[PDB]
Amino acid sequence: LHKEPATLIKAIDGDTVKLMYKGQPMTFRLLLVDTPEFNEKYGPEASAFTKKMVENAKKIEVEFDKGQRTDKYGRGLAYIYADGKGVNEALVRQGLAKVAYVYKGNNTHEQLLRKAEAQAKKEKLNIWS
């Protein structure tokens, strides 16, 4: 897989973000994770965490997996990085997302994220509390 440039347009919630990618505005949905919706428990904390991560970043990158790059809603499906750090993994590591929506052929970072989830669950963090 390879990292490509993008710039923040706007934070949306825990696992969606609006980015400019190849010069066009797109909503991105983070692969392999699921944050609570804003109205659910840890929803607000998940949104705040992703917001801080992407807003503070000097450099946002998007990384597509091997499979479909857009979902049925026209959202881009990617791993997103903020100053080289995985947002997807950071959320799971902090117990603010669950590994989820693991579809065959877009699952390159599955095992890396499951290892993160295990540590968050061990630490009883947030969702796992």
Ligand X SMILES: Cc1cn([C@H]2C[C@H](OP(=O)(O)O)[C@@H](COP(=O)(O)O)O2)c(=O)[nH]c1=O
Q: Binding site residues for Ca(2+), as ranges?
A: 15, 34-35
State the DSSP H helix or E strand holding residue 78, giving kind and residue range, or none if neither: strand 76-82
Instruction: State the binding partner of 98 from Ca ion, ligand X, none, CB within 5 to 8 A by kind.
Output: none
| Rounded alpha-carbon distances, angstroms, from residue 88 to 23, 24, 97 | 23, 22, 8
Catalytic annotation present for 69:
no
Q: Does 31 bind ligand X (CB under 6 A)?
A: yes
Q: Is residue 29 near ligand X by the rule CB under 6 A?
A: yes
Query: How far, in Å, CA of 129 to CA of 65, rounded?
Result: 31
CA dist., res. 96 & res. 25, Å (int)? 26
**Annotated catalytic residue, options 4, 29, 55, 123:** 29
Write out the residues near ligand X by the rule CB under 6 A. Answer: 29, 31, 34, 71-72, 77, 101, 103, 106
Catalytic residues: 29, 37, 75
